[PDB]
Design a protein that fits this description.
By secondary structure, the protein is an alpha/beta fold. It has one domain: Glutaredoxin, CATH 3.40.30.10. Helix content is 27%, strand content 20%. It is built from six helices and six strands. The chain has helices at residues 2-6, 36-39, 42-50, 75-80, 97-102, 129-137, and strands spanning 9-10, 26-31, 58-63, 90-92, 109-113, 119-124. A six-stranded mixed β-sheet has the order 1-4-3-2-5-6. Strand 5 (109-113) and strand 6 form a beta hairpin. The longest helix has 9 residues, at 42-50. The chain is globular, with a radius of gyration of 14 Å. It starts with a helix and ends in a 6-residue tail after the last helix. The structure holds chloride ion (2 copies). Has an important function as a repair enzyme for proteins that have been inactivated by oxidation. Catalyzes the reversible oxidation-reduction of methionine sulfoxide in proteins to methionine. This is Peptide methionine sulfoxide reductase MsrA/MsrB. Residues 1-141 form the Thioredoxin domain. In the N-terminal section; belongs to the thioredoxin family. In the central section; belongs to the MsrA Met sulfoxide reductase family. Disulfide bonds join 35-38.
Length: 143
């Protein structure tokens, strides 16, 4: 995942690596434009990404154009450009390479990648602040 991720860019054409520090675990939120749950959480997730509470980990989100009912590549970025979450990292994975690799099937879903690149936990559905903090405290913890 860490490699495929480093080869991707954000919805606004910046290297995903810009949001990934080498010695930190990575918390990834998978979502899609058609999901009301996901749309209603964009502001919250942006807040989390900038919150000191999660400073010990990288926090990004992944949208997958042309995968799981998401808008095709190009169309997605144009749609998302209409929203405003400047501090929310939105990596676009055309075809959902990472999602398939992790067998993501519902949105939202969260994955915690160890600092070394190994997938440590995959959580289906939305998580709240308490569950997110638990996930960072211990990948195997009961959120
Ligand atoms: Cl729950
Ligand atoms: Cl909540």
């Amino acid at each position: 995942v860490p490699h495929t991720l480093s080869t991707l860019k954000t919805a606004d054409n910046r290297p995903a690596s810009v949001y990934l520090k080498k010695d930190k675990p990575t918390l990834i939120k998978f979502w899609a434009s058609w999901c009301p749950l996901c749309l209603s959480e964009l502001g919250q997730t942006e807040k989390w990404a900038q919150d000191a509470k999660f400073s010990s980990a990288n926090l990004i989100t992944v949208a997958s154009p042309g995968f799981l009912h998401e808008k095709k590549d190009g169309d997605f970025q144009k749609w998302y450009a209409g929203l405003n979450y400047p501090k929310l990292p939105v990596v676009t994975d055309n075809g959902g390479t990472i999602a398939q690799s992790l067998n993501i099937s519902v949105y939202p879903s969260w994955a915690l990648i160890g600092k070394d690149g190994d997938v440590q936990r995959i959580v289906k559905g939305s998580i709240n602040e308490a569950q997110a903090l638990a996930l960072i405290r211990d990948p195997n913890a009961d959120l």
